[PDB]
Design a protein around this ligand. Structure first.
Ligand code: HEM
Ligand code: HEM
Ligand code: HEM
Ligand code: HEM
Lengths: 50, 48, 376, 70, 52, 122, 59, 376, 48
């Protein structure tokens, strides 16, 4: 189904509409409390050992 | 809020207050409490 | 799906696992879980102590000593009970001060505040009659002084006093009935706590911002279980220190003397958590007026959700007056432990007057002015 | 369960793709200073009132004890 | 007489040392498990059209 | 009395402007407004005023509250470029709420109640 | 950065019925180590004051 | 509505005023409200009793005597609390027999039956350890005979026994801990009763016809309040007769002798409501096998919603077999008060065998045959 | 009609019964309670 008839968005180049039509792969999280690992880091987490 | 906010917002009017007949009939329950206490304690020389 | 098949799984899941909770709750919202844990601790250690205590005036002190020395783990249980009462009162007082700071009793949470005030009154009575059970000098003489306040009521004062005592003085029937009432009242506290918590789950908690939080809610069980565990461990550290290193720090040395009705101590004082009420009573040189002032304090506590305006951080005048109220109640706590003196009488009178002024004048009127400042 | 009208994009990262307590050492002095900056006025007025009234009361009690001497 | 009032002071202090050590380690472990659970929320990204 | 208030009113206005300056400095770091500080659960007139609003205003109010609650969880403030754009005193609710309260005051003088109650859950 | 090993994961972590007995033996040894450290520190600090020191002195 | 604005009034209205109940319930559906009334009466009388009872050897008998002759209304309170246990067990037994007759534990009311069986076990333990408290000959020797039956579990026997006693024989620690356990267990009874009633309200009650009754439901609070009041007045008449005219009819005269650990009475029998289990235990010439049979009876009680097929009337074979089961249980109750004799041993063995035969063979197989006859 | 009624009607087949792997995974909980009891009691070298 079409998103205009189902989600019924507002029209315009708003910040939410830009990510809705084309999401970016360069997602920035907040890093004030936790610094992320490098993306694609594999392996079973060390937190189980802790 | 409902207690003093209603007085301060002007929502407590004479037309919204209970009537004097309502206050008379509600306040008649005071004699019921007195006679209930006198029935429970029976602290009288009233029987003679 | 599995909790949809049994009622008891469904109620537990709804109210403990998947209950929505504001995501910005700080560590001031841990006092309730800590108070519940301290009630459970008091009930467990009291049930265990009741298997060795004897509620008779010839065997009460001796059974306390025998439990201390001869019963395995009896000293841990007895010190845990006696200091868990003080930690219970610390956690509950901080919980109430949180509610006073944020104005958490306001609409639609009037029932929560009223059931809280009921809980606090039951807690006070429970601790007071539990302190009489060791039958020491403070245990005897405090029960004598406090239950003699009934004679301030005219005509039928002495009759109620003798009915509560079971005789002409505090003696063995008083101790036996106090033991039964003391065993009984914690279960009423558990029921009241269940009702109090189920009243809050109708609308949810307030947040530190003081705004509506229905847009940002997360599950209680996954997130706030660990956050409550952290505070429980900080409380367990203080509990361990008080039980093992300083066991008689929050007590009185006169309660280790056996009770003597023919020689009173020089300084009859209660436990620390009843000292502000005692200071309010001692500051007024009239017994009826002192009892009335205590009753008016608790009436003002009941009337807080209907006369109180003014809440958290963004309401700054009442937020500043909160710290003056806190200093006043701690000054009342300190004044209760000191002897009667003209300057302590004057300072206690002024402190009681300021407590009444804050409760009945600042909270309605200053709250209304700051609502008119912010939204008028 | 209380429908809320809202327009947003939300992103969340796995808790095994970031660190747990390493930033806690960096932010600890800043959080200490921020806490005292936010609660400085209330703690100060509490301390001033409590310790001033207690000190005045204890001083006048000591004067009362001295006045009873011979 | 000080022994007579507190006959188990040495045993109480040994148990208190063990309890304080254990609870102090458990406080760090519980803080670790609290921060691990709350990490996807503390680092989430919200983008909206509101500027104000 | 009359001009008593006449003069007592500029002092009220000065205190109100100082209060709004301090609180709006506190509010702007969270991205909030003065009208966002009113809870439909806390007041039934605010609950009535909020359903008299167009949907985009309600969507904006919910977005601002969500951003502020996220900031409160993260122990953060807005960045400087967002913080300089904040308008804490731009009202969206005061006209509608004033009309609602005037209607309730009008109904009360004739003995009528408000045509709404508190929000009741469960 | 630091990451738990896969071969050590497949042995002691994938099933709870293997994880729990390992947890109990680790709990036993942790309690033994804490007991040893506390007792050694207490006996070293209070040497010459205990009852056993007087009894071993009288031999 | 006024009850729609306070959540306490909404729950009370929903579950006590407007609750839809089948209109054709007869007077055998008044067992539950009578059992709740008896539980409340026992709690009230006991809490009043505990203000004059001392839970120590060399004071317990004298405290009960001082309660009987010196406390105002104390004899009424003691006799009411003693005979109320008998009436509580009469009512709960008739309730269980009603559920056995009608198949009340079947789907979807299995949780109701299971919580009932748990309540019955807690009632048995509560009544036994409360019977120990007056510290007579029957109290001491029954507590000795029952608690020294843990020497049937291999290896871990006398360890558990000595940990229960707090010593090497039944003595002051056993009485002192039995007082605390007996005070505490009725609050668990009240909580389990609340959970039990809440489990029934999910699906409502069965009717004497045994058919679906959703079409004919009426309000509880008007129609079944006076109907419960009538049965409560009958129970109050029986209770008043037992208290005032035959206060020691259901007891044992040996419990008016102070306990002597070195002299045993000729016949050691429990109270009447424990006699059927005692007959099952005493009939089997092996202690471990007797405890296994006692456990198997309660296991078969728990398994009844999952194995029991067949209800009241229109299922006539199981209806007739119910009366043989009732006769068997009453025979076991009669046999427990007799002496050990080869004919009584043989008859008790046959009665226990038939009890197991009915609970485990008749209820599934005869019920399945009835279903195949009626709807096959 | 949960219990013996399920097996009288023929609803308990060779299928819908737990597998051998399921019973082994459930049966592996037998060692956990044994190890937990031995951890709680600690009867060291008590095996004859
Ligand atoms: C079912 C619950 C409880 C039971 C059975 C119980 C039982 C007892 C008993 C038998 C004593 C006397 C033994 C002794 O003095 O060490 C005692 C003391 C005491 N209890 Fe509890 N208690 C319970 C709950 C509570 C609660 C909820 C509080 C709340 C504050 C409390 C406060 C106290 C206090 C202050 C003492 C005096 C301790 C002392 O100074 O020695 N108890 N309790
Ligand atoms: C045994 C005593 C108590 C227990 C177990 C208890 C439990 C709780 C719990 C678990 C909460 C939810 C989270 C929290 O705020 O910590 C809560 C909230 C609350 N309690 Fe208590 N409480 C007790 C006593 C009191 C008292 C004495 C008062 C007031 C006089 C009170 C007033 C409140 C209020 C107003 C709230 C709602 C606050 C909010 O959500 O912002 N409670 N209580
Ligand atoms: C203190 C003990 C008990 C209390 C207060 C209690 C209370 C009640 C009440 C109030 C009802 C609804 C009215 C009625 O049908 O009588 C009920 C129903 C029921 N009770 Fe009890 N009960 C108790 C013990 C038991 C026991 C010991 C059992 C079974 C072993 C049991 C099994 C049931 C069942 C199966 C029903 C549903 C009956 C039907 O709807 O056909 N209850 N109970
Ligand atoms: C909070 C609830 C209760 C309390 C405080 C309580 C208290 C007591 C006390 C103090 C005694 C010893 C005094 C005496 O025997 O006269 C006693 C005895 C006894 N209790 Fe209760 N009781 C409670 C509930 C119950 C219940 C629910 C039952 C039965 C299911 C029960 C059964 C008995 C029996 C059979 C005795 C022996 C009475 C005798 O032969 O003299 N009690 N109880």
């Amino acid at each position: 189904s079409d998103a205009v008839e189902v989600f019924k968005p507002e029209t315009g180049l708003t910040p939410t509409n830009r990510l809705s039509m084309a999401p970016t792969p360069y997602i920035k999280y907040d890093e004030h409390n936790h610094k992320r690992f490098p993306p694609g880091t594999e392996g079973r987490p060390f937190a189980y050992f802790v | 809020p409902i207690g003093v906010w209603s007085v301060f917002q002007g929502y407590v009017t004479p037309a919204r207050l209970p009537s004097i007949q309502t206050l008379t009939r509600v306040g008649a329950w005071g004699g019921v409490v007195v006679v209930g206490g006198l029935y429970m304690v029976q602290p009288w020389d009233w029987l003679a | 799906r599995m909790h949809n098949k049994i009622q008891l799984l469904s109620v537990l899941n709804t109210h403990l696992v998947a209950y929505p909770t504001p995501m910005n709750l700080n560590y001031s919202w841990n006092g309730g879980s800590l108070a519940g844990m301290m009630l459970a601790s008091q009930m467990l250690t009291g049930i265990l102590l009741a298997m060795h205590y004897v509620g008779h005036v010839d065997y009460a002190f001796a059974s306390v000593q025998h439990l201390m020395t001869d019963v395995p783990s009896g000293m841990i249980l007895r010190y845990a009970h006696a200091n868990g009462a003080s930690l219970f009162f610390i956690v509950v007082y901080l919980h109430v001060l949180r509610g006073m700071y944020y104005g958490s009793g306001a609409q639609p949470r009037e029932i929560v505040w009223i059931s809280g005030v009921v809980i606090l009154l039951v807690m006070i009575i429970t601790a007071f009659i539990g302190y009489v059970l060791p039958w020491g000098q403070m245990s005897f003489w405090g029960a004598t002084v406090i239950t003699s306040l009934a004679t301030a009521i005219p005509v039928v004062g002495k009759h109620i006093m003798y009915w509560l005592w079971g005789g002409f003085s505090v003696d063995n029937p008083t101790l036996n009935r106090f033991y039964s009432f003391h065993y009984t009242l914690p279960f009423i506290l558990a029921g009241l706590s269940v009702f109090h918590i189920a009243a809050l789950h109708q609308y949810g908690s307030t947040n530190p911002l003081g705004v509506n939080s229905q847009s940002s809610l997360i599950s209680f069980g996954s997130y706030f279980g660990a956050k409550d565990l952290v505070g429980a461990l900080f409380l367990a550290l203080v509990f361990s220190i008080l039980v093992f290193f300083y066991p008689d720090l929050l007590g009185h040395p006169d309660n280790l003397i056996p009770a003597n009705p023919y020689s009173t101590p020089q300084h009859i004082v209660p436990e620390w958590y009843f000292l502000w009420v005692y200071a309010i009573l001692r500051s007024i040189p009239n017994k009826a007026m002192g009892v009335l002032a205590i009753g008016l304090v608790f009436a003002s506590l009941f009337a807080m959700p209907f006369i109180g305006l003014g809440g958290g951080k963004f309401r700054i005048i009442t937020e500043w007056l909160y710290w003056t109220f806190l200093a006043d109640v701690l000054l009342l706590t300190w004044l209760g432990g000191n002897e009667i003196t003209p300057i302590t009488s004057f300072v206690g009178q002024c402190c009681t007057a300021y407590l009444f002024f804050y409760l009945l004048v600042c909270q309605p009127l200053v709250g209304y002015l700051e609502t008119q400042f912010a939204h008028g | 369960r209380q429908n809320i009208p809202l327009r947003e994009i939300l992103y969340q990262l796995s808790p095994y793709q970031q660190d747990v307590i390493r930033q806690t050492f960096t932010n600890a002095p800043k959080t200490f200073l921020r806490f005292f900056k936010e609660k400085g006025v209330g703690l100060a007025t509490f301390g001033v009132l409590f310790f001033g009234i207690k000190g005045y009361t204890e001083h006048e009690m000591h004067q009362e004890r001295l006045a009873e001497r011979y | 007489l000080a022994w007579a009032s507190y006959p188990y002071q040495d045993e109480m202090r040994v148990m208190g040392i063990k309890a304080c050590l254990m609870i102090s380690i458990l406080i760090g472990f519980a803080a670790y498990s609290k921060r691990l659970r709350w990490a996807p929320i503390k680092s989430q990204r919200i983008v909206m059209d509101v500027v104000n | 009395t009359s001009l008593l208030k006449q003069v007592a009113l500029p002092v009220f206005n000065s205190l109100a402007t100082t209060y709004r300056s301090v609180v709006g400095a506190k509010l702007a770091k969270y991205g909030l407004r003065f009208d966002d500080l009113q809870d439909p659960l806390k007041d039934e007139d605010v609950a009535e005023a909020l359903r008299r609003l167009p949907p985009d205003v309600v969507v904006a109010r919910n977005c601002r509250l969500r951003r502020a609650l996220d900031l409160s969880c993260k122990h953060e403030a807005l960045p400087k470029d967002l913080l300089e754009k904040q308008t804490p005193e731009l009202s969206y609710l005061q006209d509608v709420l004033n009309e609602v309260r005037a209607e309730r005051r009008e109904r009360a003088q004739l003995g009528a109640p408000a045509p709404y109650t508190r929000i009741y859950y469960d | 950065v630091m990451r738990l090993s896969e071969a050590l994961y497949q042995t002691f972590f994938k099933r709870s019925t293997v994880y729990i007995p390992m947890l109990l033996v680790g709990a036993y040894f942790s309690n033994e180590a804490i007991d040893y450290a506390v007792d050694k520190m207490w006996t070293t600090r209070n040497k010459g004051k205990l009852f056993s020191d007087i009894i071993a002195e009288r031999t």
